[PDB]
Paper text:
In this study, we look at how a mitochondrial homolog of the molecular chaperone Hsp90 (TRAP1)2 may be regulated by calcium binding via a novel mechanism. All Hsp90s are homodimers with each protomer composed of 3 globular domains: an ATP-binding N-terminal domain (NTD), a middle domain, and C-terminal dimerizing domain (CTD). TRAP1 structural studies have revealed the presence of a remarkably asymmetric closed state in the presence of nonhydrolyzable ATP analogs that leads to a two-step sequential ATP hydrolysis mechanism, with the first ATP leading to a flip in asymmetry, and the second leading to re-opening. We found that unlike most other Hsp90 homologs, the TRAP1 ATPase can efficiently utilize calcium alone to support hydrolysis, and that the relative preference for magnesium or calcium depends upon the concentration of free ATP.
To determine where calcium binds in the closed state and any consequences on the structure, we replaced the magnesium in our standard zTRAP1 crystallization conditions with calcium. Despite the similarity in overall structure, no density coordinating the β- and γ-phosphates, where magnesium would be, was observed. To unambiguously determine where calcium binds, we exploited the anomalous X-ray scattering signal from calcium and collected two datasets: one at 7450 eV (1.664 Å) and 11111 eV (1.116 Å). Using phases from the solved structure without the contribution of calcium atoms, the resulting anomalous difference density map reveals one strong peak within the nucleotide pocket of each protomer, located just above the α-phosphate (inset). The density is tightly coordinated by six oxygen atoms in an octahedral arrangement near the “lid” of the NTD (4 backbone carbonyl oxygens, a tyrosine hydroxyl, and the α-phosphate). Rather than being a magnesium mimic positioned to stabilize negative charge build-up on the β- and γ-phosphates at the catalytic transition state, direct visualization of the calcium-binding site by crystallography shows that calcium occupies a site near the α-phosphate. In the closed state, the calcium is octahedrally coordinated by backbone carbonyl oxygens from the ATP lid, Tyr-221 hydroxyl, and the ATP α-phosphate oxygen. Unlike the magnesium site, this site is configured quite differently in the apo state versus the closed state, thus providing a unique coupling between open-closed conformation and calcium binding. Structural data supports that the calcium-binding cavity near the α-phosphate presented here is conserved in the GHKL (Gyrase, Hsp90, histidine Kinase and MutL) ATPase superfamily. The remarkable change in cooperativity observed with calcium indicates that TRAP1 can adopt a switch-like response to calcium at high ATP levels, providing a strong connection between calcium concentration in the mitochondrial matrix and TRAP1 ATPase-driven cycling.
Author numbering:
A (entry chain A): 85 to 152, 154 to 239, 242 to 369, 376 to 503, 507 to 511, 513 to 531, 540 to 566, 591 to 616, ...
B (entry chain B): 85 to 148, 153 to 202, 209 to 372, 377 to 388, 393 to 639, 652 to 719
The structure:
Amino acid sequence: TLHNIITDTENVQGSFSKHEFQAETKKLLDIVARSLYSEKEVFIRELISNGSDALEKLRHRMITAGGDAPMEIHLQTDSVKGTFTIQDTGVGMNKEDLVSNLGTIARSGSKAFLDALQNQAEASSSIIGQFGVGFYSAFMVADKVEVYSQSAEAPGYKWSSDGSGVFEVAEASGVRQGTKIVLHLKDDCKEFSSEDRVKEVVTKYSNFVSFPIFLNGRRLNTLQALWMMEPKDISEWQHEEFYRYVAQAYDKPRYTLHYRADAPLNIRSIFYVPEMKPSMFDSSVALYSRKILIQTKATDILPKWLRFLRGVVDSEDIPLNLSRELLQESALIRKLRDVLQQRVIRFLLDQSKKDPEKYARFFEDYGLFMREGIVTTGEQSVKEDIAKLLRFESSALPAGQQTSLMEYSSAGTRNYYLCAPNRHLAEHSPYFEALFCFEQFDELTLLHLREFDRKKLISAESEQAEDLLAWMRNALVQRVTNIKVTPLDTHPAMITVLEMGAARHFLRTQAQILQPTLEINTGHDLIKKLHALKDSNPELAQLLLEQIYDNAMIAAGLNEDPRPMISRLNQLLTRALEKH
Amino acid sequence: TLHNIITDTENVQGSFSKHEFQAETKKLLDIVARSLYSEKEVFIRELISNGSDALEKLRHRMITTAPMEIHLQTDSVKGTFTIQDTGVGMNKEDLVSNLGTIARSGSKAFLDALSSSIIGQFGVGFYSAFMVADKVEVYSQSAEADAPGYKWSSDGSGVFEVAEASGVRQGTKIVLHLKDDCKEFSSEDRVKEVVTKYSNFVSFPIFLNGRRLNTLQALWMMEPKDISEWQHEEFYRYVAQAYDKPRYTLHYRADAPLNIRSIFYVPEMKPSMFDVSRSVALYSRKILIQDILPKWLRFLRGVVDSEDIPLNLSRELLQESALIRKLRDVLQQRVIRFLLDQSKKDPEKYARFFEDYGLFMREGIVTTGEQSVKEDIAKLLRFESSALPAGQQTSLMEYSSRMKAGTRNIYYLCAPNRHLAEHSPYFEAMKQKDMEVLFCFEQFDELTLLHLREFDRKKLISAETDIVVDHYKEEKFQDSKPASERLSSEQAEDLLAWMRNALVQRVTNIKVTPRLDTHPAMITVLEMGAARHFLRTILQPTLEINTGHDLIKKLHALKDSNPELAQLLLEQIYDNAMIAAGLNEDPRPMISRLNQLLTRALEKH
Ligand SMILES: Nc1ncnc2c1ncn2[C@@H]1O[C@H](COP(=O)(O)OP(=O)(O)NP(=O)(O)O)[C@@H](O)[C@H]1O
Ligand SMILES: Nc1ncnc2c1ncn2[C@@H]1O[C@H](COP(=O)(O)OP(=O)(O)NP(=O)(O)O)[C@@H](O)[C@H]1O
Ligand SMILES: [Ca+2]
Ligand SMILES: [Ca+2]
């Protein structure tokens, strides 16, 4: 059935013809100035980053060949003339620099600058540009672009282009040291002559730019990149502020993890666990690089189960996509994710020690995420790492108290859980008579776990009544699957269930078959009464039977909402109080 | 107050010079190889699209015959990936011009207007081969003139050599000498994965290593009336990656505000409760792109194509998020209409759908800002009614249209089931009015109606709420029982006084109500729904008693004859009333109090 036409049949005949690749410049502009980014607004991000680079370069040159203005990014909107303007007080550009850097696509003076630095210099980690195309994103939104630039040298210039394959350059007077870029906005892009709009964009992408940013004379970016500062020299109130900002929330972080590492990768990061539990009516961690936003929802840096974390991750040597809203597929990113997952797990274990009470609450609220982690990830090594966070009750421990899976195993022991709705049902299991996982998805969780600690874990799964016994089976027909006697004290009866699967598959139903078994205490003065009132008062006996049964179901946690019984109970009480 | 440096002070001195834009060619090639596509694998998509273009160009010119296929071959030994197409090929000046020049697209200049089949556009996809390859060889036969075959060759150095060659078949063959880095693309299973993912709907047949791949019809682009039930079942299973079938299918086409070609399926399966806690493919020109639906419509599976969405150069991003919000709103409106239509066509089937997917409506209502969208979604909700018989579902619309002209509100009552609603103490009270009352039985119905607030400018008010408001109006309500069967005002006063002492710190108020019949008492709270919700993490509760009720009269009698029993009874009545109110905490602690009440009451029996 095979059909392949591919065959080694070709032979070159003759020689020569060496050619150089070329570039259709006019179309390449158009690509850059249109087809690169998801949203037009990104041109602000690009021009501010460029201005930041011009300031960073000035700062760096003055370390050594020191000189004397303030280092600032200024924005101005003109809604009437329909312009947007940005000015920096940076190194500026001479004529040669404008023709070269602005007039050549893919040429990056800032990349050249970066390559020539001592790799330890502070400018090494803060210069943003590398691709040599960002500036052309202005033509995304503008028919005319004007650049006024004064070098920090021994003549000011104006660079001008409509974005159609040509530009002009003339000498300019009255040009302040640095660079002024004026965009004559297109009709459909006039929203960028709106102050509120430009403000939105600056704070979205450029809020943590090193240098101060002014819009129409007013400072904006008062927030500092906490993730780049020394952990122990940050306050509790600053995290509170920063968390809220980056999480877009209004509560506190209940956990803060400030993780810096130069080690497997450059990592400057902060992670928060919200104080508030998430629920039925609901951002993630954001990815930055050199203080500039890449993704508000970082996709490939953390596992999926860790998405309950808010915060920030910034690497400076992470390979960026040309759009600067994506990462390139890389072994570094698959490692960073492995590193962050292990670091966050170690952090949460440390918290289960520092404050086991507090961790308990955190596992109530977010423990569903670990459970998901175990069921999803393929790596068996990792499944047992996440399983270190799980908490349950034990057969041997008391109620309301939990333990980790790593609580030893006590001699030969080489494998012991019963997933049940609640305590009372578990302690009365047939298969318990040989761990207590009361939470939902606990079964499915350990069923995917399969092993922990190389160890194992498998689903541990007088005669005066008789008439009464036989009578109740005639009243509660197809409600229970059996009725028996029991030696119970304060309770007239109790409800026990055999298969724990049958109890789950029943609470999800909002008769229902689960083969429930009702055990009766013939030492109770209610059962004693029931026996008598059987023949003495059949209609009162019926009411009292259904109550005792209902009561036992409630006490077993198999009747959470007793609304159905209230009318009938009221009737039993009046009948029962007829006497008094 | 202000600090602004920008001033209109720059003036041009003297003449200027004109310049042309230039390009750093080697660095642009670097960018395409290393920084343009976020995933290496899409070099396969780009080469296949390029080959598909060469075939459409041949077909077009073949309206002046030959076979028209795409061949992939993977040499694991030699570390080689090959693609051959039988299309229009290219001559020497075509090789030199189109392959040698970045951002040059033959498949663009070609567009003599009439097709919508051509994919090429940007002029860079071919160079995506250098993501994964040290060396690329191209063999191309122009198939036009007395034109020779040619071999184009490049190591990715910014240089390429061209010689004329023999035994070059009609079309183009591209050989990638893969990098040790990416030898996965000489794996047949791996290369198949990539074709299935991006190029599964390509027009022409694609063979991998001699086996024809199971490419599909792009169903969403076709005439809705020509697609059989069974064709939808198959496509559903493909796009959802499912093993069941659709219960609803919406094939939606529009040119109107936006170009839309889409298919939406609602699975026959109930959504997994685990998957809800933890959806639709987006295409252009038969090639896959990667929210578009509102989050509450994430239960839909299916596909969306729109020619108005512009692609980015990487072909993985969309380019006007105002366009997407517009598209999202249009689809949401259409899906709502569609489901309303299905409610009318088959109400029985829609009950099943509502029962299995209702939670998504409720979510969408609770999480929307815009009231109009809340009310749009709320059209999908179904309830029972005090007007209609048991079992019969209704909507807010049918409630609205039943409303007498003067009536200003929509009354509801939330209970577990019909029987409890019908015999609810809160409904007994509403029955004294002649207003219709909606009956809502799902867990989060009340929460949904609190967030909904109003519908068609009519306020949503619970029975329980409206019962409290009627206190601060004229009672006006007369007891169901005559004065003969009730406690005298003097015995009632005495009983309240005693009850106030026995429940001191548990109730704000105790008072009699004439608005009950069957029940001894009830708990009222103005904001009952809100209270009920908050309890799903004391109050200011009011207990209202029925002095015609036998249990209450007996309570009044017991407080003097058997005070301990009287207090025990009162505790259970208040407990009972809190349960009926849906305000009870753990009911288990009471079971002990109840058993010791029951024994002591049944003690003279
Ligand atoms: N405001 C400015 N002041 C001084 N020089 C500038 C300014 N803006 C741009 N330049 C120079 O022009 C070059 C080209 O900028 P651009 O074309 O945006 O590429 P890039 O910003 O360097 N890299 P990217 O932003 O990643 O595309 C920069 O590298 C600078 O050397
Ligand atoms: N297999 C082929 N057969 C014939 N012509 C081809 C083939 N592959 C490429 N070409 C020609 O070379 C041109 C350049 O291709 P390429 O550089 O990939 O740009 P593109 O395919 O037009 N657009 P995109 O894929 O969106 O970058 C195409 O537009 C065709 O004219
Ligand atoms: Ca440039
Ligand atoms: Ca090209």
